[PDB]
Amino acid sequence: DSLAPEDGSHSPAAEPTPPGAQPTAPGSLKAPDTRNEKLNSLEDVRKGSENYALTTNQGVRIADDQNSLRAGDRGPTLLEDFILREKITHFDHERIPERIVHARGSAAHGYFQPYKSLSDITKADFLSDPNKITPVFVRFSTVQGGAGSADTVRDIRGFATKFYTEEGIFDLVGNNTPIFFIQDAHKFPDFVHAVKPEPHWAIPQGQSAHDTFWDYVSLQPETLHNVMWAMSDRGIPRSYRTMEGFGIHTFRLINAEGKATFVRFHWKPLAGKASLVWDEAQKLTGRDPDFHRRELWEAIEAGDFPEYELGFQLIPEEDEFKFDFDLLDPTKLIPEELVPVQRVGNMVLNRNPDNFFAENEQAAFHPGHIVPGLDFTNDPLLQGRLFSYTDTQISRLGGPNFHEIPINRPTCPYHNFQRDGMHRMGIDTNPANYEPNSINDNWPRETPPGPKRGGFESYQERVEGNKVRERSPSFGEYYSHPRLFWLSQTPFEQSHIVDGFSFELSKVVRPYIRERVVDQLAHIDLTLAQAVAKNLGIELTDDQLNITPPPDVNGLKKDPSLSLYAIPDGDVKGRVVAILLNDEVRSADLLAILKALKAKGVHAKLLYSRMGEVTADDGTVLPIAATFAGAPSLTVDAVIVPCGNIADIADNGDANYYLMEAYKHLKPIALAGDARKFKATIKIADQGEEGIVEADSADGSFMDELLTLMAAHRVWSRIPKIDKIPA
Amino acid sequence: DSLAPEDGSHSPAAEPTPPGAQPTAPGSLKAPDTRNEKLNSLEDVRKGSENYALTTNQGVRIADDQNSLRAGDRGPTLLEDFILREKITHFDHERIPERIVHARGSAAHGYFQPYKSLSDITKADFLSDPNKITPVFVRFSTVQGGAGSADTVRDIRGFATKFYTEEGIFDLVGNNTPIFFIQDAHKFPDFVHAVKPEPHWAIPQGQSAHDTFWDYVSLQPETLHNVMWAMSDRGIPRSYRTMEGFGIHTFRLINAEGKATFVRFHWKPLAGKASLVWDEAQKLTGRDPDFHRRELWEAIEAGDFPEYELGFQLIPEEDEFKFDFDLLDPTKLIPEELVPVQRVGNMVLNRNPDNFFAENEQAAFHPGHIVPGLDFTNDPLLQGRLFSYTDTQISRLGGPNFHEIPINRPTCPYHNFQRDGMHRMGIDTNPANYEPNSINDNWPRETPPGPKRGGFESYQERVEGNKVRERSPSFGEYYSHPRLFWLSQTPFEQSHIVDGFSFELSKVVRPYIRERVVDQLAHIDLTLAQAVAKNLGIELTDDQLNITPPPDVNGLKKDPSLSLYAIPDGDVKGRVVAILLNDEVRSADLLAILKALKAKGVHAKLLYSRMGEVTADDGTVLPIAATFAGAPSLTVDAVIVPCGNIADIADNGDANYYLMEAYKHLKPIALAGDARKFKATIKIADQGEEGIVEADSADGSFMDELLTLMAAHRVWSRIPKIDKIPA
Numbered sequence A, B: 001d002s003l004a005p006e007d008g009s010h011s012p013a014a015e016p017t018p019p020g021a022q023p024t025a026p027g028s029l030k031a032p033d034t035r036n037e038k039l040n041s042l043e044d045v046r047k048g049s050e051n052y053a054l055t056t057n058q059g060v061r062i063a064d065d066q067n068s069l070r071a072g073d074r075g076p077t078l079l080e081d082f083i084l085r086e087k088i089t090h091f092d093h094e095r096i097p098e099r100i101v102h103a104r105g106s107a108a109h110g111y112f113q114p115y116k117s118l119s120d121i122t123k124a125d126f127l128s129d130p131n132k133i134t135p136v137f138v139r140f141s142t143v144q145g146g147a148g149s150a151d152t153v154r155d156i157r158g159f160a161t162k163f164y165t166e167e168g169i170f171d172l173v174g175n176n177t178p179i180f181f182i183q184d185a186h187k188f189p190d191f192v193h194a195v196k197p198e199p200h201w202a203i204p205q206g207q208s209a210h211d212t213f214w215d216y217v218s219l220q221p222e223t224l225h226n227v228m229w230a231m232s233d234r235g236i237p238r239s240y241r242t243m244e245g246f247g248i249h250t251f252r253l254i255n256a257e258g259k260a261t262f263v264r265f266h267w268k269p270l271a272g273k274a275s276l277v278w279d280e281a282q283k284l285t286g287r288d289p290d291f292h293r294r295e296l297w298e299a300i301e302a303g304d305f306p307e308y309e310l311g312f313q314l315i316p317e318e319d320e321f322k323f324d325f326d327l328l329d330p331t332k333l334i335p336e337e338l339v340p341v342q343r344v345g346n347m348v349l350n351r352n353p354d355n356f357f358a359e360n361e362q363a364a365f366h367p368g369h370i371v372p373g374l375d376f377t378n379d380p381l382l383q384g385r386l387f388s389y390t391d392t393q394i395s396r397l398g399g400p401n402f403h404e405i406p407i408n409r410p411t412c413p414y415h416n417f418q419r420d421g422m423h424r425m426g427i428d429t430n431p432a433n434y435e436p437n438s439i440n441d442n443w444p445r446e447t448p449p450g451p452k453r454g455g456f457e458s459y460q461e462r463v464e465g466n467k468v469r470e471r472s473p474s475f476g477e478y479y480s481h482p483r484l485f486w487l488s489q490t491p492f493e494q495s496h497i498v499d500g501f502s503f504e505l506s507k508v509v510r511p512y513i514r515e516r517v518v519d520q521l522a523h524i525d526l527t528l529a530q531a532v533a534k535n536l537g538i539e540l541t542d543d544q545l546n547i548t549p550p551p552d553v554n555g556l557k558k559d560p561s562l563s564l565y566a567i568p569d570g571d572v573k574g575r576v577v578a579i580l581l582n583d584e585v586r587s588a589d590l591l592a593i594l595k596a597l598k599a600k601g602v603h604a605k606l607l608y609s610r611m612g613e614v615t616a617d618d619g620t621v622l623p624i625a626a627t628f629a630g631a632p633s634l635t636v637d638a639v640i641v642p643c644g645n646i647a648d649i650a651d652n653g654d655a656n657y658y659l660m661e662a663y664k665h666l667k668p669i670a671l672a673g674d675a676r677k678f679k680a681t682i683k684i685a686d687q688g689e690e691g692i693v694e695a696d697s698a699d700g701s702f703m704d705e706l707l708t709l710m711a712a713h714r715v716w717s718r719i720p721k722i723d724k725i726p727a
């Protein structure tokens, strides 16, 4: 009855292994000894399988799971086949509505721990002691596309963290840029409808490159700041591990003395900031639409845990009006040059889920889920968010008991007088379902606010004004933050912004929309506007050329913290290199290559023209991970070609193209021995060039140079060379 | 208050226009003069917009749709803002569950007309009169991926037609291959779970290239026939217009005399059969994941209506047991050499929907929706389908009144005693909600069966047997039909099948699964098995090399109707050519090109290195449709390069790569004058070669030669030359 192979090769090892070395697996089978309070609390609903009988949902053992019940073995199926009907009924109802936005997302378990007690600024229990370990569940996402859309689209990314604290669930529901597109939540359906596939034909998926999006942008200049970020390489991250996170809104921290401090939340990636380039990102949506989901899961299985440092920008209440912009305007960022990010703790993602649907798809995050020690502000985008995230779950998760779905359950106590609702799990024994009551001595009871374990009380902010549907005049400035962002980018980052706008606007069919957007760009920076205009065949008018640029932000000419690359921070651990094999590899080269990569935590994939094995010059049998076409250069950070029988691959079109694609995408390339003959396909002269490592053999210096290139992510100096490369 | 441009360039012309000439639009605005009975019946629910006030859903005019109501213009949002809450509530609940399978689909309205009355074989009213026009709504789909997944995946395609007949809705719910993967509906959740993204991590989207799919296949040889089709180029159609359709199951036709005839349904595409090649299809999921949806919509907007001829394979009842296979086995096809397809009528798709969600997403097709004159058989896959398609709508469409959703409503009368349910639209006035009743004189009343307008009565098939969960032994043959399919393919189609298996199995991480699948291939054809094994580094054993091939199918060693290309059926109308411009095009070349393409109904897209315009040698201003990168060769059927200032583009990497990609993908290429210098980038010698049209100018037979190549779809003779091309 055993269908597994006798050698046990069906089962992945329950130990950390590099990407591709083992089949991936549910987290509790891959890493059974990785534990936290939330993961342990899910044990009551985890279901095994080994050595159990196959049954109906009612516990009846099934004898024949291959056939329907029929009148004769060639006869009609009988209505009395309850086993068939139960199985098909469950199948028929598997799908639930996807999230209205951020439907495409990938999630993992982990933990957060503060660096020190923050009691002087907040009474939030999870920040009260460096010994406080708080389990987290984090979901990263795109915004526009459906749950089945591609990972490496150009889009904003979501970054949502559920903190299972001892005083309640706190959800920090943020994005990978520090501002949003719009100012008031009332416009959210308009903006989302504009960016989403257009309603007649439901095109395009996962793209803002269409008329309705740019129509809205051209008519709503408040959007321009976040549009700038989306058109930059920020819109195409290399990995969820290599992007920043931001809460966007100004919130409040409330301490035990009742003092409010304004705060904006930041996540700083330990792996550094790194993004793809557009042609690579777009092609990768075809070669591997699951690239980010896969890379996150495989990093965790390898022990390359994503880590993010939590940071606070803190502004005293008395400083509310000390900036050129309104702190409550979510289209404005707070420059780190003006208000530094103070690091307060670290989050580590160290276990994948067991079941994607049960844990990821059904997870409900909501920024109104705060705890004592935190509070809101009047940011009019945040204010409306507070309504949406509870409301939407009534259809998405089937009713008001969504907190009883296991992933959503608090790990701390919860007791109240709420009852019933669809799929009610908790069986209340309280004689009372109301308060005040005497029949249960008024339990469960209210708790006054206090320094710890106290009830929630809102900060008593003064409100004065008339009931109005009116935007604050302080919000009516749209160009200075886009300009600060533009001026803070490197020259190659600016080029990529220009190319982003140019590519997207080329896909807008109505030319006047393109012209209106270019006019908006002329209010931000005329170099940007002229460069985009040239790519669109648009000529700026003399009036447009005379638009006065917007003022600096509180005296800032630039803020390098807004650039992905101006200040180096990259780390190579967890990156991956393609090694292009031949049928008689120089084993000495491969030994030195793999040894150096291992010392730095860099993974490798051995590629060839077919699957199976090749044998090196010394008899070493080399297992092949993928073909050149099966694992394209898009999926790796650098390419190494060792020596050997180079004639075997010298005329292989896929092998030559592998290097040309990597070259065009600015990736480091290293060539040993006779592999240097491949310089011809990338038009590199005999004297070489920066970004192409070459030597007689692979060695320590050879690998040191390559790993130095990898630490810099891409070879930006190659950009002037790639336009003549046919790739 | 007008935001539209004064020149009116926001509004697409309400007349047929070629792809890209105008913005696309809702069908009733693009083609207001196109009508049918179903389209007319939807007018009661169509909603306009021009010249109307913006309101709440309760009809209250909105004054300020830009702001929430707050206490002061910098204050908190008020709970009494019912306008905000209604708008956000509707947004928060927009999504409904996607279809369990076939979630990704594209749909259009049209009509069907039979060629002559079929009353000798069926009393079905829609087939009773050549003047009887039946409106249709057709949805084409993939199978595996979500609603946001890509079009040009390797997968089976769905082809579902809703016929709004005078005697009820008939849904013909078929696929683009003539068999299914499994024999008994009880296994459907198993097969679908195996092909769908794996449950731990929800990878991969839109792909069968993963362990669990091939695990199931290797353990269920009944799947091998449809697997063969999926691995062939059938799995990657060029367009929904260029694929076949099949009902798969044997059904019955019932005539007025009560005689039953077995029938299998077929759709023959007027545009012929045409598919992509794998590398092109995969890259196209990245460059345009909406390619098939877009092509269908734009063909209809151009007046190039998709057309399909309905055909029947007809088998007398007394011939049930005269074949080598069981007629009720849905893993077996009926070879057209044994039972020809008899043409029945024509279907034309001539109008796009107005709202994708309302009409496409909410449409419910179900093969149990038959009409008098049709009936089922005991095919055990069909039998279980009959349960599923009603059941699934209870969650997907919110309850049992899904037939009241406008797209689903019959156009003929419907009256019964059913009442209530969620979203009940119909307000019944019958004093009775039961029968028999006297209080309404028993109306609505049963109708006896008869030759026309009679009640439904099942064919009184004899049933004899014990109640068993047992597969018919006649179904227990798995290899002859895969072999017949294999032997019917051209040599290049066979190579593409080999490459499909090889690519997919290379993505299976557990090697023993690959080995088990190769063993199954050895039971089908040893040449196929050896070629796949070689690409996987697997050596067949002596026992595998000695497996006796399966028998022929009723004496057939081939049936050319199973090949896409063995018998040419290509038509060029609706195809598209890229024209690569330069900054001083030879206008005489372009005149001849566009004239010849227009005469054959072939579209063109003028491409350059930027948007805007270029000016030809004679001063003609040429509008640019897209950049080389913006509209890659993947999206066209052929490439033409006119003469002019060729030096302007000769060193353009994108322009050179455009030709190399098209060359690798076997597309016709035509080069005029100095454009012949591009032969160097595709390694074509001065002598030229078949598939590369060249001449001093585009006059003479230049365009005839190119259009002849296009009629043959791809340049199969070029295959030996593509492996050296780095593209």
Ligand code: HDD
Pocket (backbone or CB within 6 Å): A099, A100, A101, A102, A105, A139, A140, A141, A157, A158, A159, A160, A173, A174, A175, A180, A184, A185, A188, A247, A248, A249, A330, A363, A364, A365, A381, A384, A385, A388, A389, A390, A392, A393, B088, B092
């Ligand atoms: C008033 C409506 C509204 C507005 C203005 C916003 N959102 Fe939102 N957001 C939703 C309404 C919403 C929602 C419809 O409630 C979602 C979709 C499904 C869900 O559970 O919540 C959601 C989902 C959602 C997710 C995915 C959570 C997950 O992984 O499940 C993230 C990361 C964000 N949002 C982040 C933001 C950010 C950073 C915003 C700007 C500051 C923002 N949202 C504005």
Ligand code: HDD
Pocket (backbone or CB within 6 Å): A088, A092, B099, B100, B101, B102, B105, B139, B140, B141, B157, B158, B159, B160, B173, B174, B175, B180, B184, B185, B188, B247, B248, B249, B330, B363, B364, B365, B381, B384, B385, B388, B389, B390, B392, B393
């Ligand atoms: C017992 C389960 C079952 C089985 C054996 C099949 N299907 Fe099915 N099919 C469904 C259960 C189902 C479903 C779950 O009921 C769907 C999904 C959502 C829906 O409305 O119907 C569906 C959808 C669906 C669609 C999409 C309709 C649309 O566009 O909305 C097509 C074309 C098919 N199927 C075709 C087939 C074919 C050709 C089959 C094999 C002969 C087949 N199905 C077997």
